[PDB]
């Protein structure tokens, strides 16, 4: 599964600076979703990849940023 990283507390995306390959997004995506995760910067938000199917991604039904 894939999807935008989301702050569980605030409901909002993680902003990045460098489009495409991005080590920040990479590390945050693995930390949140696990060592197998990938991630890159797409339209200036962190997009996580190789997520487990049950992974919770953006948007949170309840919480807008």
């Amino acid at each position, epitope marked *: 599964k894939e999807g935008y990283l989301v702050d569980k507390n605030t409901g909002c995306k993680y*902003e*990045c*600076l460098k*489009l495409g390959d*991005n*080590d*920040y997004c990479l590390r945050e995506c693995k930390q949140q979703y696990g060592k197998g995760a990938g991630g890159y*910067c797409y*339209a*200036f938000a962190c997009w996580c990849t190789h997520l487990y199917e049950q992974a919770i991604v953006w948007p949170l039904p309840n919480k807008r940023c």
Partner: antibody, heavy 117, light 108 residues
């Protein structure tokens, strides 16, 4: 309300250096990416530099790369911009801005930077 | 290289209560990643819209954003005096992020 306050602007000669600061209120400073932009008086807007949460991701406009350095102190709730090797064409109002995931959702009132002999 | 944003017209002379239609054209598609900002004289820019049509909080109904691809517009149905400002569009599909040169809406 969400507020940003710039300081550190002023007049310098070519080759000189300045350090701008922006202080945020009305939001959790450390939860947002922060940016510097600029506006030549009478002219349009130009993105200058930016820094992600936790200082994990940093970038600069090409025209200021190697010359400018951006940083943040979450504890102090401050954003900084070290401006080195200043040029006449860097003269402009500098804005502190909160990141809007592609856009810039909150702007300070700006601080004037003048590079003139 | 970078995406060029063309705003038209450069200047719009109008009376309060009238309607204003501002145009922003991108040299190539930015899909929907287009923002609108307002800058009043002696003030900082203020976000109006993101994702081309989405309204930021506290923006009056008389403001609407539209468009996609290369052509976007900002419409003000009935100009209030506080509506008189410079307006900028901005793309974020690609890096570097770029702005239009702005449209000033001013009195006749």
């Amino acid at each position: 309300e969400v507020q940003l306050v710039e300081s550190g602007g002023g007049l310098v000669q070519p080759g000189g250096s300045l350090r701008l600061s922006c202080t945020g209120s009305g939001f959790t400073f450390d939860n947002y990416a922060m940016h510097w932009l600029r506006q030549v008086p009478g002219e349009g807007l130009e993105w200058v530099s930016g820094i992600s949460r936790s200082s994990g991701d940093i970038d600069y406009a090409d025209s200021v790369k190697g010359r400018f350095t951006i940083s943040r102190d979450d504890a102090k709730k401050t954003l900084s911009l070290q401006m080195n090797s200043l040029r006449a064409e860097d003269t402009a109002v500098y804005y502190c801005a909160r990141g809007g995931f592609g856009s810039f959702d909150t702007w300070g009132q700006g601080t004037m930077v003048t590079v003139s002999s | 290289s970078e995406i060029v944003l063309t705003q038209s017209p450069a200047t719009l002379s109008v009376s309060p209560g009238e309607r204003a239609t501002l145009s922003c054209r991108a040299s190539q598609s930015v899909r929907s990643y287009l923002a609108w900002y307002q800058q009043k004289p002696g003030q900082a820019p203020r976000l109006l819209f993101s994702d081309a049509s989405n309204r930021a909080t506290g923006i009056p109904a008389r403001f609407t954003g539209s468009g996609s691809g290369t052509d976007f517009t900002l419409t003000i149905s009935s100009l209030e005096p506080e509506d008189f400002a410079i307006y900028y569009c901005q793309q974020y599909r690609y890096s570097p992020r770029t702005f239009g040169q702005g449209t000033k809406v001013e009195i006749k």
